[PDB]
Design a binder for this molecule. Structure first.
Ligand SMILES: [Mg+2]
Ligand SMILES: [Mg+2]
Ligand SMILES: [Mg+2]
Ligand SMILES: [Mg+2]
Ligand SMILES: [Mg+2]
Ligand SMILES: [Mg+2]
Ligand SMILES: [Mg+2]
Ligand SMILES: [Mg+2]
Ligand SMILES: [Mg+2]
Ligand SMILES: [Mg+2]
Ligand SMILES: [Mg+2]
Ligand SMILES: [Mg+2]
Ligand SMILES: [Mg+2]
Ligand SMILES: [Mg+2]
Ligand SMILES: [Mg+2]
Ligand SMILES: [Mg+2]
Ligand SMILES: [Mg+2]
Ligand SMILES: [Mg+2]
Ligand SMILES: [Mg+2]
Ligand SMILES: [Mg+2]
Ligand SMILES: [Mg+2]
Ligand SMILES: [Mg+2]
Ligand SMILES: [Mg+2]
Ligand SMILES: [Mg+2]
Ligand SMILES: [Mg+2]
Ligand SMILES: [Mg+2]
Ligand SMILES: [Mg+2]
Ligand SMILES: [Mg+2]
Lengths: 116, 137, 52, 112, 101
RNA sequence: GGUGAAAAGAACCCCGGGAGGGGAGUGAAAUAGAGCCUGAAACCGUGGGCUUACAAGCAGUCACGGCCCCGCAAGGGGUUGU
RNA sequence: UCGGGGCUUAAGCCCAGCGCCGAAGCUGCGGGUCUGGGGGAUGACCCCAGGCGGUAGGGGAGCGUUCCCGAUGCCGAUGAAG
């Protein structure tokens, strides 16, 4: 009994050419395809771990940029808040600052006060 | 999902350079250029103020700089070296010394350069008065 | 087959691009005094002949 | 309504007719005939011929009105090439692809 | 009115009535968990200590589910090592009912 | 190596020197039309959508945004500016 | 050319201090799998703790291809394979 290749490999190829859709020129036609997808994989997994630090950052700038209007460092604003005992500002949600600034401004004296 | 700015009108500014340590001055002018004192900051976007500087020619600079500090400008050719000392700069077109140092603190991309275009410099004052101008410091 | 040779297959892009100045422009035709016929200017053209 | 015409297996090279076809894409039929006529290229004498018949059917086959038909679309496709050998210096031998075309024009009545 | 509830590792601004998905919960197919975790309010609830004391927010487990699968795949070169993995993260769905702090 | 069940192998008209086509006709089917079942891939083309002429590139990835498309919306798809 | 811009009671050097930033480390929430402990007389499934970078290589469980029994069967023109 001889098992010719038949469908099998054609199918495994297609599978990838699919993933490789929209890639530049030849990378969407082959095994340059695969090589490309290979790296793509690693890039995302790596970038998914980055997307964290990505925002952490974006947020901070946003805050530091805010509480500098009330005259101070993210470096101390954040400090007060630790003293202030408030876990509230998960940096994510100090996008208060952008909308509903009152609560921020409040949050400010709050740590200002918390300071000394 | 984090907030995201929509289109906005660009705030302008005006600065007086006289007495300012050139670099220390550039730094701010930079941080203004990126919409980075605003709290709704956005990297990919370019909503920076429109910093306008005047009395550039007067920029203080510490140490022996004027004499000592050299400006390299490499033309394309054999021995295109071209070293220009800090004084000759101010002495002839001086706006540069400031320009030539914000461009420096601006990031590198197309955006960086979009920004370098917001910044407008004269030694004067007498900048094209237009509207905004909220002096700063 | 020898000394200088192409280092990489030029790409579909790069190829087609070089080709950008390849397109031809249509002839220059003008109606004649005689017929409603179409002529390249400054010619004579059959089925129409000419005077003088 | 379209009036198709295809002449296939023509012994001119694709890359080479494409040029002429490109000359008349979306032109008035009366216009084309004139262009194809005074264009300097072996290419036309084919695209002509195939264009001319495109019109014929348009007319003796679809009532369509000559005086108002235009080259809606036209194109040319590569048909199978004639490989020939070519004894080349120092013994090595090369093979020449004498390529081949399927020229196609399709007319439409203008408007209303 | 604003209120920042902290459910499942992470915290969310929350409104009178809005749908929001969160780190999976043990709740019924359609019951009511109160997010006893709450911080802030539409008028400075202000969370002096970590948690706000006499406060909370009601929500309805709309119905658990799972998400569009991700392809976590790894590849080290020169070294014949490739690893492809499917991983759809599960996510329980919330209709926010009572803002009532 | 392989039209189709059967040659029923396309009369006849039309453009063309022919080739080849367009109609007409046969057939269940003719993108089954004669190296004609199926007809993948590379490769060439035509039309459409998004995109691109101050810009630096293992060509992807992460994010936001604009446009186009499927859905009542929540959503998704395509594209790619930064 | 100190990565660069730029820096001079500093953005340098020494001494002391409080902050904050900062990895795929540690935490939190969710989920895999395997090993161990337990419930359970039991199988079952559930809970708790822990291990889970990897080339040469050892070990385990699977997926698909052709063929044979299951076929004098079953699906198939209301459409098999591809
Ligand atoms: Mg094989
Ligand atoms: Mg793309
Ligand atoms: Mg192309
Ligand atoms: Mg010779
Ligand atoms: Mg010989
Ligand atoms: Mg490598
Ligand atoms: Mg016969
Ligand atoms: Mg016929
Ligand atoms: Mg007759
Ligand atoms: Mg003859
Ligand atoms: Mg014949
Ligand atoms: Mg059929
Ligand atoms: Mg077919
Ligand atoms: Mg034939
Ligand atoms: Mg043939
Ligand atoms: Mg095909
Ligand atoms: Mg479209
Ligand atoms: Mg441009
Ligand atoms: Mg679209
Ligand atoms: Mg960890
Ligand atoms: Mg865990
Ligand atoms: Mg289980
Ligand atoms: Mg574990
Ligand atoms: Mg480990
Ligand atoms: Mg391992
Ligand atoms: Mg180990
Ligand atoms: Mg066999
Ligand atoms: Mg069917």
């Amino acid at each position: 009994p001889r098992a010719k290749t038949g469908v099998v490999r054609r199918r495994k190829h297609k599978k990838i050419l699919k993933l490789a859709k929209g890639y530049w020129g030849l990378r969407s036609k082959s095994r340059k395809a695969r090589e490309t997808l290979f790296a793509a994989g690693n890039y995302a997994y790596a970038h998914r771990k980055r997307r964290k630090r990505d925002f952490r950052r974006l947020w901070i700038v946003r805050i530091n940029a805010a509480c500098r209007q009330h005259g101070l460092n993210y470096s101390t604003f954040i400090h007060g808040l630790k003293k202030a005992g408030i876990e509230v500002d998960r940096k994510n949600l100090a996008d208060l600052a952008v909308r509903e600034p009152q609560v921020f401004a409040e949050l400010v004296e709050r740590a200002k006060a918390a300071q000394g | 999902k984090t907030y995201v700015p929509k289109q906005v009108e660009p705030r302008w500014v005006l600065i007086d350079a006289e007495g300012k340590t050139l670099g220390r001055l550039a730094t701010k002018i930079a941080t203004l250029l990126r919409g980075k004192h605003r709290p709704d900051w956005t990297p990919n976007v370019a909503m920076g103020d429109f910093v306008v500087v005047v009395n550039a020619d007067k920029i203080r600079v510490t140490g022996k700089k004027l004499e000592q500090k050299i400006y390299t400008r490499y033309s394309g050719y054999p021995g295109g070296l071209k070293k220009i000392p800090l004084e000759k700069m101010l002495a002839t077109h001086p706006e540069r010394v400031l320009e030539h140092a914000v461009k420096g603190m601006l990031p590198k991309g197309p955006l960086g350069r979009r920004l370098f275009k917001r910044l407008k410099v004269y030694a004067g004052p007498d900048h094209p008065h237009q509207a905004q101008r909220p002096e700063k410091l | 087959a020898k000394h200088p040779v192409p280092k990489k297959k030029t790409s579909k892009a790069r190829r087609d691009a070089r080709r950008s100045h390849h397109a031809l422009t249509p002839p220059i035709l003008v109606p004649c005094p005689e017929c409603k016929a179409m002529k390249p200017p400054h010619t004579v053209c059959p089925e129409c002949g000419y005077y003088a | 309504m379209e009036a198709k015409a295809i002449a296939r297996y023509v012994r001119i090279s694709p890359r080479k007719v494409r040029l002429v076809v490109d000359l008349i894409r979306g032109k008035s039929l009366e216009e084309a005939r004139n262009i194809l006529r005074y264009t300097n290229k072996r290419g036309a004498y084919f695209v002509a011929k195939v264009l001319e018949s495109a019109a014929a059917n348009a007319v003796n086959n679809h009532d369509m009105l000559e005086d108002r038909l235009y080259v809606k679309a036209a194109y040319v496709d590569e048909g199978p090439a004639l490989k020939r050998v070519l004894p080349r210096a120092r013994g090595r031998a090369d093979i020449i692809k004498k390529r081949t075309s399927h020229i196609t024009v399709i007319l439409g009545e203008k408007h209303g | 009115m604003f209120a920042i509830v902290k459910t499942g590792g992470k915290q969310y601004r929350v409104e009178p009535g809005l749908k929001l998905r969160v780190e999976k919960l043990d709740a019924e197919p359609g019951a009511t968990v109160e997010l006893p975790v709450l911080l802030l309010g539409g008028e400075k609830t202000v969370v002096g200590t970590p948690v706000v004391e006499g406060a909370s927010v009601v929500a309805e487990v709309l119905g658990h589910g799972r998400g569009k699968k991700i392809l976590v795949s790894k590849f080290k070169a020169k070294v014949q090592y490739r690893r492809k993995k499917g991983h759809r993260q599960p996510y329980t769905e919330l209709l926010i009912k009572e803002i009532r702090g």
